Design a protein around this motif. Structure first.
Motif, PDB file in Angstrom:
ATOM      1  N   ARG A   1     -18.478  -6.403   5.892  1.00  0.00           N
ATOM      2  CA  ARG A   1     -18.413  -6.618   7.229  1.00  0.00           C
ATOM      3  C   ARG A   1     -16.990  -6.846   7.741  1.00  0.00           C
ATOM      4  N   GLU A   2     -16.614  -7.954   7.247  1.00  0.00           N
ATOM      5  CA  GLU A   2     -15.131  -8.516   7.591  1.00  0.00           C
ATOM      6  C   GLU A   2     -14.094  -7.591   7.158  1.00  0.00           C
ATOM      7  N   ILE A   3     -14.242  -6.880   6.077  1.00  0.00           N
ATOM      8  CA  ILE A   3     -13.226  -6.103   5.329  1.00  0.00           C
ATOM      9  C   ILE A   3     -13.383  -4.623   6.158  1.00  0.00           C
ATOM     10  N   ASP A   4     -14.430  -4.397   6.732  1.00  0.00           N
ATOM     11  CA  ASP A   4     -14.491  -3.170   7.505  1.00  0.00           C
ATOM     12  C   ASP A   4     -13.704  -3.374   9.066  1.00  0.00           C
ATOM     13  N   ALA A   5     -13.862  -4.547   9.689  1.00  0.00           N
ATOM     14  CA  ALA A   5     -13.376  -5.179  10.746  1.00  0.00           C
ATOM     15  C   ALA A   5     -11.883  -5.167  10.628  1.00  0.00           C
ATOM     16  N   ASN A   6     -11.496  -5.836   9.694  1.00  0.00           N
ATOM     17  CA  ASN A   6     -10.011  -5.849   9.315  1.00  0.00           C
ATOM     18  C   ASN A   6      -9.306  -4.496   9.238  1.00  0.00           C
ATOM     19  N   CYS A   7     -10.079  -3.644   8.569  1.00  0.00           N
ATOM     20  CA  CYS A   7      -9.417  -2.393   8.402  1.00  0.00           C
ATOM     21  C   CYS A   7      -9.456  -1.527   9.649  1.00  0.00           C
ATOM     22  N   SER A   8     -10.279  -1.458  10.617  1.00  0.00           N
ATOM     23  CA  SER A   8     -10.598  -0.766  11.787  1.00  0.00           C
ATOM     24  C   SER A   8      -9.529  -1.239  12.641  1.00  0.00           C
ATOM     25  N   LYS A   9      -9.054  -2.673  12.766  1.00  0.00           N
ATOM     26  CA  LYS A   9      -8.035  -2.999  13.390  1.00  0.00           C
ATOM     27  C   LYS A   9      -6.572  -2.439  12.981  1.00  0.00           C
TER      28      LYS A   9
ATOM     29  N   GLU B   1      -3.176  -6.295   5.931  1.00  0.00           N
ATOM     30  CA  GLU B   1      -3.303  -5.671   4.339  1.00  0.00           C
ATOM     31  C   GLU B   1      -3.306  -6.551   3.540  1.00  0.00           C
ATOM     32  N   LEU B   2      -2.474  -7.794   3.662  1.00  0.00           N
ATOM     33  CA  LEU B   2      -2.807  -9.036   2.748  1.00  0.00           C
ATOM     34  C   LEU B   2      -4.142  -9.623   2.955  1.00  0.00           C
ATOM     35  N   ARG B   3      -4.741  -9.631   4.188  1.00  0.00           N
ATOM     36  CA  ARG B   3      -6.083 -10.322   4.338  1.00  0.00           C
ATOM     37  C   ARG B   3      -6.939  -9.152   3.722  1.00  0.00           C
ATOM     38  N   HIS B   4      -6.996  -7.913   3.755  1.00  0.00           N
ATOM     39  CA  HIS B   4      -7.601  -7.097   2.872  1.00  0.00           C
ATOM     40  C   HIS B   4      -7.595  -7.502   1.438  1.00  0.00           C
ATOM     41  N   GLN B   5      -6.728  -7.391   0.662  1.00  0.00           N
ATOM     42  CA  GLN B   5      -6.479  -7.913  -0.778  1.00  0.00           C
ATOM     43  C   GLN B   5      -7.163  -9.175  -0.957  1.00  0.00           C
ATOM     44  N   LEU B   6      -6.960 -10.301  -0.109  1.00  0.00           N
ATOM     45  CA  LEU B   6      -7.454 -11.580  -0.112  1.00  0.00           C
ATOM     46  C   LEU B   6      -8.995 -11.613  -0.230  1.00  0.00           C
ATOM     47  N   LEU B   7      -9.596 -10.766   0.886  1.00  0.00           N
ATOM     48  CA  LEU B   7     -11.150 -10.544   1.037  1.00  0.00           C
ATOM     49  C   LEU B   7     -11.689  -9.808  -0.255  1.00  0.00           C
ATOM     50  N   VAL B   8     -10.933  -8.936  -0.847  1.00  0.00           N
ATOM     51  CA  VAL B   8     -11.635  -8.306  -1.732  1.00  0.00           C
ATOM     52  C   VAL B   8     -11.464  -9.114  -2.950  1.00  0.00           C
ATOM     53  N   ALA B   9     -10.378  -9.849  -3.218  1.00  0.00           N
ATOM     54  CA  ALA B   9     -10.447 -10.629  -4.310  1.00  0.00           C
ATOM     55  C   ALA B   9     -11.514 -11.776  -4.296  1.00  0.00           C
TER      56      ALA B   9
ATOM     57  N   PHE C   1       0.853  -1.144  -0.035  1.00  0.00           N
ATOM     58  CA  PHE C   1      -0.074   0.104  -0.115  1.00  0.00           C
ATOM     59  C   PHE C   1       0.846   1.498  -0.116  1.00  0.00           C
ATOM     60  N   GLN C   2       0.381   2.280  -0.232  1.00  0.00           N
ATOM     61  CA  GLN C   2       1.141   3.468  -0.180  1.00  0.00           C
ATOM     62  C   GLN C   2       0.179   5.023   0.135  1.00  0.00           C
ATOM     63  N   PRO C   3       0.769   5.687   0.740  1.00  0.00           N
ATOM     64  CA  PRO C   3      -0.106   7.147   1.097  1.00  0.00           C
ATOM     65  C   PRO C   3      -0.516   7.803   0.044  1.00  0.00           C
ATOM     66  N   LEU C   4      -1.594   8.429  -0.311  1.00  0.00           N
ATOM     67  CA  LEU C   4      -2.049   9.461  -1.259  1.00  0.00           C
ATOM     68  C   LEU C   4      -2.692  10.366  -0.776  1.00  0.00           C
ATOM     69  N   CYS C   5      -2.653  11.502  -1.338  1.00  0.00           N
ATOM     70  CA  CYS C   5      -3.495  12.964  -0.781  1.00  0.00           C
ATOM     71  C   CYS C   5      -4.224  13.464  -1.870  1.00  0.00           C
ATOM     72  N   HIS C   6      -5.380  13.990  -1.563  1.00  0.00           N
ATOM     73  CA  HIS C   6      -6.535  14.492  -2.403  1.00  0.00           C
ATOM     74  C   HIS C   6      -5.792  15.733  -3.192  1.00  0.00           C
ATOM     75  N   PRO C   7      -5.742  15.715  -4.671  1.00  0.00           N
ATOM     76  CA  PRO C   7      -5.141  16.737  -5.496  1.00  0.00           C
ATOM     77  C   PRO C   7      -5.293  17.972  -5.160  1.00  0.00           C
ATOM     78  N   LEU C   8      -6.609  18.372  -4.579  1.00  0.00           N
ATOM     79  CA  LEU C   8      -7.223  19.796  -4.244  1.00  0.00           C
ATOM     80  C   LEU C   8      -6.502  20.247  -2.724  1.00  0.00           C
ATOM     81  N   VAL C   9      -5.883  19.392  -2.129  1.00  0.00           N
ATOM     82  CA  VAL C   9      -5.336  19.646  -0.674  1.00  0.00           C
ATOM     83  C   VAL C   9      -4.942  21.190  -0.562  1.00  0.00           C
TER      84      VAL C   9
END
Ligand SMILES: CC(C)=CCC/C(C)=C/CC/C(C)=C(\F)COP(=O)(O)OP(=O)(O)O
Ligand SMILES: CC(C)=CCC/C(C)=C/CC/C(C)=C(\F)COP(=O)(O)OP(=O)(O)O
Ligand SMILES: [Mg+2]
Lengths: 297, 294
Positions: B193-201, B248-256, B9-17
């Motif tokens: 739900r699972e993706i949300d839980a994983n991200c929150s942690k 992060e791996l889990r997020h990618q796996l769950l989305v897949a 993953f990599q950080p990103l900022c909104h263009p209009l910041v």
């Protein structure tokens, strides 16, 4: 995927491993009751003396064979208790204890009995005091094989604390001392209780990581892999990776603890040898666990 | 030093910041009653609009400012509550809820009252449906800014499960949807739900890793894991950082898997990528905010 993370512990292997392995394998192939030759072949491929030589690389040259024989018969029995009750298995081991003490003679027609009897007799003949000192640690382990453990809620911290006192790991430490001719007083051992606990945890978690599939299948459990997977809600594979990193932190702790013993002026030559040997058990157990077919490589 | 492990993953900022930051900072500088000049210097330095743009880089161009204004006032209120008792803090925020709803007129003489009133009026003017949907998430959070935390023996699993229900992270996700114009049905939300839980942690532990020194000046994964594993806090941080990469791996796996199964809609696809940037943005934020300093 399980690529072990970087470690500063380099395992050592006993120089006589090739010589002692054929001697000990040779002995069991001559006396032990192997069914088919597929078994004989599978036994030699298991390399039981090889693990022993990674666990006790600094064992004295005329003592490494005792340790190899003891772990080889203990592993063979392990294979056996697998196809036995709790009562059958407990009865099986129990008979072997008085025989081990030498209080009961073996039936010369039952390999496990005479192998056990002669082994212990040979150990007492080499060093009576030290041989007698490893009796109870061995029996504690044997009886523990056939447990019966109180089921209760156990999280990761309770599990690790529990493994700090693992009797199998205390047996290895005891057998290490015998193998190296290291006479340590309980006063000296008091001083390294934290190092022993940390080592016991490392050995148990590394074994957990590699024997998960084994245990899981025979389960169709109480292991750090399942517990961490549930607490962190990740797969068992991900849990193994995380535990592996924790194992490296315990390796670092071992080093810091050893440096403190030394700094506080509490180290003795015997303790310096002992703590270094614990390190060899941790790294040796890792190399073996990840290569042995016992956990299906 | 603490070196974060590798990440995909990599950080990103909104263009209009830059533009939004100036637009929103000026608004508060004009209306918010800052005590002294110093306060105004500290406020601009905190750059709440820049923080907002790091968390919601895929927000819509005409909606990112609503998110910067909302988090900005929320940050300001957060600080003020620091100088108030539980009871007072509760009454303070409780007064602002009917006002956010537009049910009670603000006291035009009290900035926080009319600032909140006008912001919600304006959001409802832009997208009534979506503005109304983020009402409860904001109130859950506002009421939590003052609730009492009960101490009790807590292991890693219990702690992580508690963080999976973090109202602050829930707020972030709801505001991200509003800011991105993503109206997800109940079935879509149930699906993630699972993706949300994983991200929150992930968000919570990364915050823990970097807020530890400041906190150690109690309830955190750093102390809990160090005690459970019997290692130092620095060691615990290293282990937790690797657990974060596993999430992060889990997020990618769950989305897949979501996609594999015929369940990933265009709205959910935008949403889960949005969470990816919240995780990478939160990590950068955690590593640089003065909130955790000294
Ligand atoms: C006769 C045997 C195996 C052990 C006595 C000696 C020991 C302790 C050698 C160290 C390694 C070993 C395999 C365990 F501690 C136990 O693993 P676990 O209890 O989970 O059984 P497995 O891992 O082999 O399935
Ligand atoms: C507006 C505020 C303050 C919270 C709701 C909006 C959020 C979650 C903004 C996100 C970044 C942030 C302040 C953290 F991650 C700190 O969480 P946390 O606030 O729990 O750190 P602590 O409050 O525990 O010190
Ligand atoms: Mg095992």
């Amino acid at each position: 995927s399980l690529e072990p993370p970087p470690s500063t512990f380099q395992p050592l292997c006993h120089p006589l491993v090739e010589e002692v392995s054929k001697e000990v394998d040779g002995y069991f192939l001559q006396h032990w009751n192997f069914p088919n030759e597929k078994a004989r072949k599978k036994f030699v491929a298991a390399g039981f003396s090889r693990v022993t030589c990674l666990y006790f690389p600094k064992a004295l040259d005329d003592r490494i064979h005792f340790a190899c024989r003891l772990l080889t018969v203990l592993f063979l029995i392990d294979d056996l208790l697998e196809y036995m009750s709790f009562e059958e298995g407990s009865a099986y081991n129990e008979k072997l204890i008085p025989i081990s003490r030498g209080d009961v003679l073996p039936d010369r027609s039952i390999p496990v009995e005479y192998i056990i009897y002669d082994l212990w007799e040979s150990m007492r003949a080499h060093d009576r005091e030290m041989a007698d000192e490893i009796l109870e640690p061995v029996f504690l382990f044997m009886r523990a094989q056939t447990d019966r453990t109180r089921a209760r809620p156990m999280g990761l911290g309770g599990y690790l604390e529990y493994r700090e006192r693992d009797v199998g790991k205390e047996l290895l430490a005891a057998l290490m001392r015998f193998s190296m001719g290291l006479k340590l007083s309980p006063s000296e051992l008091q001083r390294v209780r934290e190092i022993d606990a940390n080592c016991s945890k490392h050995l148990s978690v590394v074994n957990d990581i590699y024997s998960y599939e084994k245990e899981l299948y025979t389960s169709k459990l109480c292991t750090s892999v399942q517990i961490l997977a549930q607490e962190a809600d990740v797969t068992a594979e991900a849990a193994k990776r995380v535990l592996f990193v924790m194992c490296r932190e315990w390796e670092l702790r071992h080093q810091l603890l050893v440096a403190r013993l030394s700094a506080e002026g509490l180290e003795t030559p015997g303790l310096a040898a002992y703590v270094e040997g614990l390190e060899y058990q941790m790294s040796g157990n890792e190399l073996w666990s990840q290569t042995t077919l016992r956990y299906s490589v």
